[PDB]
């Protein structure tokens, strides 16, 4: 019933504490082949798979508004990372999964959102982050958020070393509460996987 199993490549993630999958803005991808690539683009499926990253430790001291961010893509030491150094242009979506594991005795709430064209938000703007593809994480209800977003931006293809369209954001909505039965803190991890990965301008070898 409430048990979801996500699979990207030869990697899977089975979440029992899931609310569902939120698809941001659209469920389809703008044609990966446009006039800016002159039909010289290709798809690299070997890169469409999960990679992990620890975001932060959610503690009782962090109040409302505490915000942590992770601009994508980040340094990747795998196949995807190899692509970034071998090609001038790339484009891809993101299958994001964020988990804050504690126990049913913890209280509190986290907002998990994917933001296009990140900009530092002011205290007041934070009250409206729900305008972006998001999902909440509350111990009593779920320990895993799951968001899926497509590629976008002014350009059909991008140079990730100069611009990062999507930015993962996690913000404390209501501080973590603890009992004598609860967990003391909750470590928030991210399980991310790039989607519909396409490369275009093959670069020379650096030697």
């Amino acid at each position: 019933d409430r048990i979801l199993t996500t699979r990207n490549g030869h990697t899977t993630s089975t979440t029992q504490s899931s609310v569902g999958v939120t698809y941001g803005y659209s469920t389809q991808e703008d044609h990966v082949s446009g006039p800016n690539t002159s039909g010289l683009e290709t798809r690299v499926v070997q890169a469409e798979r999960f990679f992990k990253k620890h975001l932060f430790d959610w503690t009782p001291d962090k109040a409302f508004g505490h915000l942590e961010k992770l601009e994508l893509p980040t340094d990747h030491k795998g196949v995807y990372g190899c692509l970034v150094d071998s090609f001038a242009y790339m484009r891809n979506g993101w299958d994001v999964e964020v988990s804050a594991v504690g126990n049913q005795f913890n209280g509190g709430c986290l907002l998990v959102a994917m933001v296009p064209e990140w900009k530092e938000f002011t205290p007041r703007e934070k009250y409206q982050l729900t305008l972006f593809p998001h999902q909440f994480i509350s111990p009593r209800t779920n320990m895993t958020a799951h968001i899926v977003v497509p590629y976008l931006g002014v350009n059909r293809y991008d140079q990730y070393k100069k611009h990062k369209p999507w930015t993962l954001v996690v913000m404390v909505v209501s501080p973590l509460t603890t009992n004598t039965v609860s967990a003391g803190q909750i470590k928030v991890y991210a399980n991310i996987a790039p989607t519909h990965v396409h490369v275009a301008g093959e670069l020379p070898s650096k030697e």
Binding site: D1, R2, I3, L4, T5, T6, R7, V21
Partner: peptide, 6 residues
């Protein structure tokens, strides 16, 4: 068991 998002 449950749903799949392959």
């Amino acid at each position: 068991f449950g749903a799949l998002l392959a």
